JSON list of C-alpha atoms in Angstrom, two decimals:
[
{"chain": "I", "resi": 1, "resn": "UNK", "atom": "CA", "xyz": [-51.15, 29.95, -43.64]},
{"chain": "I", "resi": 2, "resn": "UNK", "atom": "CA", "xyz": [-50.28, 29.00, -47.55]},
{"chain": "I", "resi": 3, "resn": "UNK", "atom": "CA", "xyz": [-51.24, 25.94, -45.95]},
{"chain": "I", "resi": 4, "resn": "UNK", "atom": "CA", "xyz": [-55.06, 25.75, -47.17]},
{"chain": "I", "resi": 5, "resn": "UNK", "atom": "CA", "xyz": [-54.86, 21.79, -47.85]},
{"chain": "I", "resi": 6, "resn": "UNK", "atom": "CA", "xyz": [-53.74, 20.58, -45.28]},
{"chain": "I", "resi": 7, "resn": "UNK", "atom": "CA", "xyz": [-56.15, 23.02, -43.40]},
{"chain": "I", "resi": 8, "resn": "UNK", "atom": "CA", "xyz": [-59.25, 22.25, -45.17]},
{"chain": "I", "resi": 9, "resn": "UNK", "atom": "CA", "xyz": [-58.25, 18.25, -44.26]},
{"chain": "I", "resi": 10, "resn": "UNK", "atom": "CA", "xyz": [-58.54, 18.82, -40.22]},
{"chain": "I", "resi": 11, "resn": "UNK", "atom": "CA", "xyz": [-61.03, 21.21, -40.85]},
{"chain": "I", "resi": 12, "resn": "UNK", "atom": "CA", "xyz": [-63.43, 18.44, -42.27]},
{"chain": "I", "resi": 13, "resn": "UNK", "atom": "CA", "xyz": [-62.33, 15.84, -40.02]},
{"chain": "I", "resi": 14, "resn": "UNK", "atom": "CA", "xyz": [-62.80, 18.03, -36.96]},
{"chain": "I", "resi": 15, "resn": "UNK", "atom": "CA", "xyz": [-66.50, 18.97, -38.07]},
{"chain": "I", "resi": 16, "resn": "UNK", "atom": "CA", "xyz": [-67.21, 14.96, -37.82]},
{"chain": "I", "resi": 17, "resn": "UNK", "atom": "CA", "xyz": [-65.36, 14.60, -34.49]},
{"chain": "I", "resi": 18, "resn": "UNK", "atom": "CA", "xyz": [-67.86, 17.54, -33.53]},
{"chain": "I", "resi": 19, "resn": "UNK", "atom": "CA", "xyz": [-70.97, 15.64, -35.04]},
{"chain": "I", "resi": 20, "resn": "UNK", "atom": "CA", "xyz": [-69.75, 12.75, -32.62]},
{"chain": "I", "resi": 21, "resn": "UNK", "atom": "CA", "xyz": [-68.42, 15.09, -29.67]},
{"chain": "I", "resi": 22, "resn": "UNK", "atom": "CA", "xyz": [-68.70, 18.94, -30.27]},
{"chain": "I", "resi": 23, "resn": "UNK", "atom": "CA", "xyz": [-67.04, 19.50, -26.87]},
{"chain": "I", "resi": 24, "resn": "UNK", "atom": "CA", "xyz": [-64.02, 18.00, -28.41]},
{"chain": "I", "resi": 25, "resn": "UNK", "atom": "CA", "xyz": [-61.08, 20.89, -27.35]},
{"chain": "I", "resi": 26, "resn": "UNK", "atom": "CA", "xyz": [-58.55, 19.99, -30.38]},
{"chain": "I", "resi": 27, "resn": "UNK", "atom": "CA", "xyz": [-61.69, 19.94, -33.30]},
{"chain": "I", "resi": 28, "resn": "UNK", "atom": "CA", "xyz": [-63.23, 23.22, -32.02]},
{"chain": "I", "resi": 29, "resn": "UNK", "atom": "CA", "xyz": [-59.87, 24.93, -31.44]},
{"chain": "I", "resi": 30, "resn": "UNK", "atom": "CA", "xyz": [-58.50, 24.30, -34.92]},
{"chain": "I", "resi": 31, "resn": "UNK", "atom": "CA", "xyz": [-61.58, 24.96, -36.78]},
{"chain": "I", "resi": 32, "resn": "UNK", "atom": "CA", "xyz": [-61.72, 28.52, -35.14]},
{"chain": "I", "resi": 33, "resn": "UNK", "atom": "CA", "xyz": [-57.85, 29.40, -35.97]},
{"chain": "I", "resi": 34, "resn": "UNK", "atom": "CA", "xyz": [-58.38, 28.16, -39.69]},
{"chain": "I", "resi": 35, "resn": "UNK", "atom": "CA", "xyz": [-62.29, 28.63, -40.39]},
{"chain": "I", "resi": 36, "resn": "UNK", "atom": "CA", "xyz": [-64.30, 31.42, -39.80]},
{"chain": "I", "resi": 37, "resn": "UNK", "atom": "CA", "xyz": [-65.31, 30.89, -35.66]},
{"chain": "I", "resi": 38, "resn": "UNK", "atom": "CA", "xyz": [-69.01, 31.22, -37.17]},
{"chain": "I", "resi": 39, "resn": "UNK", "atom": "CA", "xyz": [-68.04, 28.10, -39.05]},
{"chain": "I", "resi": 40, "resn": "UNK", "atom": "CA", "xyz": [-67.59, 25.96, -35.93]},
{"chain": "I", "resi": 41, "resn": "UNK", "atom": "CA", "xyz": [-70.74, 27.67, -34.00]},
{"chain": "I", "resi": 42, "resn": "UNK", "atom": "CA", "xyz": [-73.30, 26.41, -37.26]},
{"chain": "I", "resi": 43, "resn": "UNK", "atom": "CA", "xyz": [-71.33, 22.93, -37.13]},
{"chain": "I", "resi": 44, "resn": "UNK", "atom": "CA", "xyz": [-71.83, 22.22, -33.06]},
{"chain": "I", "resi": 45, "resn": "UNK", "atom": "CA", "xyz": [-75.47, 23.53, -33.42]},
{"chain": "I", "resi": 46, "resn": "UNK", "atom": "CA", "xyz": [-76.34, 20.61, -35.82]},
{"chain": "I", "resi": 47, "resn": "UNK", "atom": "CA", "xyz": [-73.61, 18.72, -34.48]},
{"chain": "I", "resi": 48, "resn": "UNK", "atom": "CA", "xyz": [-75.84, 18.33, -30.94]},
{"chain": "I", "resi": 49, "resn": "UNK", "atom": "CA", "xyz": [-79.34, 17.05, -33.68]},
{"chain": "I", "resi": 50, "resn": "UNK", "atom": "CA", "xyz": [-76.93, 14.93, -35.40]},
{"chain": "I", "resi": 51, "resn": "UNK", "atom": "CA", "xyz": [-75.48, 12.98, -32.21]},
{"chain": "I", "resi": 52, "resn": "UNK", "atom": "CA", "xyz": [-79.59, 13.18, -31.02]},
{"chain": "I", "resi": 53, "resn": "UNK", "atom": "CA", "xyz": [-80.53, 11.57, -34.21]},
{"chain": "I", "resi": 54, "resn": "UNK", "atom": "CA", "xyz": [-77.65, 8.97, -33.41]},
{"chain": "I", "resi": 55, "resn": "UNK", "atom": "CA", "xyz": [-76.13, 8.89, -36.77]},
{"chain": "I", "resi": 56, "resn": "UNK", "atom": "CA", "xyz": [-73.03, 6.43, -36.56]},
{"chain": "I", "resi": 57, "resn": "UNK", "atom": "CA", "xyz": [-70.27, 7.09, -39.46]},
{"chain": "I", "resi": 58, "resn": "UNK", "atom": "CA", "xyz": [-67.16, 5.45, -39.60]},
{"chain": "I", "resi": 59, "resn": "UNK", "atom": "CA", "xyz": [-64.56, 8.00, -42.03]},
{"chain": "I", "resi": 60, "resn": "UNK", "atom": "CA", "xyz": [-63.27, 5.42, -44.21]},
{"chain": "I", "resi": 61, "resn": "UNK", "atom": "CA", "xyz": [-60.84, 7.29, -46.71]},
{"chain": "I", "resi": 62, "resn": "UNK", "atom": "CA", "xyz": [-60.16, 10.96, -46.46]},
{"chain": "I", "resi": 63, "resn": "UNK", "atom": "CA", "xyz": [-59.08, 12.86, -50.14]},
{"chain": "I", "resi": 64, "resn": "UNK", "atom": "CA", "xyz": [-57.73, 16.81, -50.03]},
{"chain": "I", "resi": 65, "resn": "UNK", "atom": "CA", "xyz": [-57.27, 18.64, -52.88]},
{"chain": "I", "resi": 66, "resn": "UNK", "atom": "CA", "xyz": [-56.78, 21.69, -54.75]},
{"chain": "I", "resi": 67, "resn": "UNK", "atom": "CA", "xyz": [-60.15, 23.27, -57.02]},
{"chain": "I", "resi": 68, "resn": "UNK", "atom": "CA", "xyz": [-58.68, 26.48, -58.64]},
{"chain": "I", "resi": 69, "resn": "UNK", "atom": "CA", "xyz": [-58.55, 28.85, -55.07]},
{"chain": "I", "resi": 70, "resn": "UNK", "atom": "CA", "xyz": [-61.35, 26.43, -53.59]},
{"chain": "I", "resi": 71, "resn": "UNK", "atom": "CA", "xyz": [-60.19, 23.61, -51.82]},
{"chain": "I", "resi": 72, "resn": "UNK", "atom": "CA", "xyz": [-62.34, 20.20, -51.64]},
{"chain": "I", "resi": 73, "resn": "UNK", "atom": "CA", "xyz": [-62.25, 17.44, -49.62]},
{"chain": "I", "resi": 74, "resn": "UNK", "atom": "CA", "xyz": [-63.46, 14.43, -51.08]},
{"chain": "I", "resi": 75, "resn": "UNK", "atom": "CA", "xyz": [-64.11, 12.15, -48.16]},
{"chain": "I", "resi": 76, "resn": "UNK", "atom": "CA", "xyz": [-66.25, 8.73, -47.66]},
{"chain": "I", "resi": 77, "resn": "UNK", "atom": "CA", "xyz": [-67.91, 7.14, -44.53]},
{"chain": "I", "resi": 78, "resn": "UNK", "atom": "CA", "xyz": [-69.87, 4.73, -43.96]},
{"chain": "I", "resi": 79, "resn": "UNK", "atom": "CA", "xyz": [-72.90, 5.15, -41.89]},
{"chain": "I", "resi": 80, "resn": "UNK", "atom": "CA", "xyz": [-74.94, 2.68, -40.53]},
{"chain": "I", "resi": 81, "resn": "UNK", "atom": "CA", "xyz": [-78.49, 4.36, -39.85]},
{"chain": "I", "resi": 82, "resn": "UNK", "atom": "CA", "xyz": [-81.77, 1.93, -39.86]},
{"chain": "I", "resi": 83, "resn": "UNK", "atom": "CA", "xyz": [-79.59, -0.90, -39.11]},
{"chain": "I", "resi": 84, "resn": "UNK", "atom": "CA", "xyz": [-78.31, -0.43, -42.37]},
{"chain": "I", "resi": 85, "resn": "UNK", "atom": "CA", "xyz": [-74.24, 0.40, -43.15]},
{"chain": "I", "resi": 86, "resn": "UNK", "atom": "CA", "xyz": [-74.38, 2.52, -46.71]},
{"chain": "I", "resi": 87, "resn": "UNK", "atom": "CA", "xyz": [-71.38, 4.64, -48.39]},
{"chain": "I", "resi": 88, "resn": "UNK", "atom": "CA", "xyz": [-72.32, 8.25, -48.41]},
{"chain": "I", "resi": 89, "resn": "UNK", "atom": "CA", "xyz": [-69.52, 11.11, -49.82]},
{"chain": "I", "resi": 90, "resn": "UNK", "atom": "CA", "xyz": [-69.15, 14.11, -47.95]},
{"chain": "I", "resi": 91, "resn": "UNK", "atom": "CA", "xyz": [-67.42, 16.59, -50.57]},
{"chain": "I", "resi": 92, "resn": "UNK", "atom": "CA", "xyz": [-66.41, 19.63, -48.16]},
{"chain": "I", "resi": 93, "resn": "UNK", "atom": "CA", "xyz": [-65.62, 22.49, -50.35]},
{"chain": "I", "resi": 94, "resn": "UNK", "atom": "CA", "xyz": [-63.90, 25.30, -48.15]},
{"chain": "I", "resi": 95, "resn": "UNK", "atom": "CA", "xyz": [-64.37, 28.56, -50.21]},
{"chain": "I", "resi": 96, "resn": "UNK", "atom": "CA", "xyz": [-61.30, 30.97, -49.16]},
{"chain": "I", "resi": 97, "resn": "UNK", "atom": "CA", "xyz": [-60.31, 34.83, -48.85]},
{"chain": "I", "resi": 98, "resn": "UNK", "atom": "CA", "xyz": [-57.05, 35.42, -48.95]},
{"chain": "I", "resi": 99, "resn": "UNK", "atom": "CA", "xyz": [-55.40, 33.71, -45.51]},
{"chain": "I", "resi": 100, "resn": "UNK", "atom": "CA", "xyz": [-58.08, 32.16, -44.11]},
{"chain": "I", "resi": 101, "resn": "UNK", "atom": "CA", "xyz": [-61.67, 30.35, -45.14]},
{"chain": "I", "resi": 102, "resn": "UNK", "atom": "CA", "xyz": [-64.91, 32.22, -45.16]},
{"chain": "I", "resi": 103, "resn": "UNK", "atom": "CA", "xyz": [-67.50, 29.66, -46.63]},
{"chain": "I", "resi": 104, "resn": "UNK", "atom": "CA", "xyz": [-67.81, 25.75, -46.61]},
{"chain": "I", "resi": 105, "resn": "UNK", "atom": "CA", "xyz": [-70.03, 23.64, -48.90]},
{"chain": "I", "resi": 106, "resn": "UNK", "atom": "CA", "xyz": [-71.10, 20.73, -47.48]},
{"chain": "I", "resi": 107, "resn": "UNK", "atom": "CA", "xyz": [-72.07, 18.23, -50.57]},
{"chain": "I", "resi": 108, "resn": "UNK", "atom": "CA", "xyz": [-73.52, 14.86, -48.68]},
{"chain": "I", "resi": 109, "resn": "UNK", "atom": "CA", "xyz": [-73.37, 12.47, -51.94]},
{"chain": "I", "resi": 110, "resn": "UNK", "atom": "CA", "xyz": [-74.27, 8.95, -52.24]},
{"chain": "I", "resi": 111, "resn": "UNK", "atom": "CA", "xyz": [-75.90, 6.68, -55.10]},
{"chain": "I", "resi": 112, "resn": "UNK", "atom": "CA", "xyz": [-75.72, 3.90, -57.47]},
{"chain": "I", "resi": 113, "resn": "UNK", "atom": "CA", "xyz": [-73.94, 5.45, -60.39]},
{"chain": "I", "resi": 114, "resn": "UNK", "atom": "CA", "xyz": [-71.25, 2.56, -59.94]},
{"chain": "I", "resi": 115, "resn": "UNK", "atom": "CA", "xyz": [-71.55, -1.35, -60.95]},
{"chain": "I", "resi": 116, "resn": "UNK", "atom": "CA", "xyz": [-71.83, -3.45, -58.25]},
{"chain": "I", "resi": 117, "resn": "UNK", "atom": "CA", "xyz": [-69.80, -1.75, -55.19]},
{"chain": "I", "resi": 118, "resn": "UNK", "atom": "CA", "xyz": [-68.83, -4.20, -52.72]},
{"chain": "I", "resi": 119, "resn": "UNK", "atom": "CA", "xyz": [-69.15, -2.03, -49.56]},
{"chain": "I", "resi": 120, "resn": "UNK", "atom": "CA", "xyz": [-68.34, -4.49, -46.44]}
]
């Protein structure tokens, strides 16, 4: 695949259907075709603590793009944990080699840098 993109989009959507459900067939599948399948076994590991801790998101907008051969996806949920709904930035950053992607950053983001976000 030239196809790194699109790729590293269902690759970071599929790691938060796994976080929800990592017996999901169409997440795990994909993530082991494009990622490294040592990518998907670290995800479903934390995945399981992450469902245990009970952590509902809700992906609100989902932004793929191109950083020099690194490819970052840019996408924001809201979670509501404590009772409380906040906006927290997941930046994905799929390192490749060559075909296929070796390494992904996961960069969990979220403060007040803005002015006066009206969140929902």
């Amino acid at each position: 695949m030239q196809d790194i993109v699109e790729a590293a989009k269902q690759a970071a959507i599929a790691i938060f259907q796994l976080w929800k459900n990592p017996t999901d067939p169409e997440a795990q599948e994909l993530l082991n075709k494009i990622l490294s399948p040592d990518v998907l076994d670290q995800v479903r590991e934390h995945a399981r603590e992450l469902q245990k801790q009970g952590i509902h998101f809700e992906v609100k907008r989902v932004e793929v793009t191109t950083d020099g051969n690194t490819v970052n996806v840019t996408v924001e949920l809201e979670e509501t944990t404590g009772g409380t709904t906040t906006n927290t930035t997941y930046e994905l950053r799929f390192e490749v080699d060559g075909d296929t992607i070796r390494r992904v950053t996961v960069t969990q983001n979220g403060g007040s840098l803005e002015h006066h976000h009206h969140h929902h």
